[PDB]
């Protein structure tokens, strides 16, 4: 819920909304899409594969 004068939005870096279309306005949250590291579990190359 945002006062009907703002256009952008952010808490630290960017979560902007309010699609810039003059005909239609709608609040769209901006979030990443679940980046993440990947790890590997190996019993040992000389034990198994």
């Amino acid at each position: 819920k945002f006062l009907p004068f703002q256009q952008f939005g952010r808490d630290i870096a960017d979560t902007t909304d309010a699609v810039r279309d003059p005909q239609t306005l709608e609040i769209l949250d901006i979030t990443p899409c679940s980046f993440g590291g990947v790890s590997v579990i190996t019993p040992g190359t000389n034990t198994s594969n």
Partner: protein, 99 residues
């Protein structure tokens, strides 16, 4: 969730840490100090307290003659610490500051 920064969960969940603490408490309650130096040997708690009294120079008979007073003082102290831990916000400061 920020960009590029993530937190890994601890290896030992808080339930497991609580289980370890409960195990240590039960061992130190039902077996004195023996469970930390080999197999656990049972011993009545008043007798363990008598041993610990004898370990600081106080004669054994002191506890066996003032057991009721000793138990009452221990219970009162435990209640007092439980009540006092919720008094000031700074009691856990040595942890909180870290975080």
């Amino acid at each position: 969730k920020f960009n590029g920064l993530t937190v890994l969960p601890p290896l030992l969940t808080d339930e497991m840490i609580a289980q370890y603490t409960s195990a240590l408490l039960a061992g130190t309650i039902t077996s004195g100090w023996t469970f930390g130096a080999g197999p656990a040997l049972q011993i009545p708690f008043p007798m363990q307290m008598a041993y610990r009294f004898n370990g600081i120079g106080v004669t054994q008979n002191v506890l066996y003659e003032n057991q009721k007073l000793i138990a009452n003082q221990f219970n009162s102290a435990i209640g007092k610490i439980q009540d006092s831990l919720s008094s000031t916000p700074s009691a856990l400061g040595k942890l909180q500051d870290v975080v």
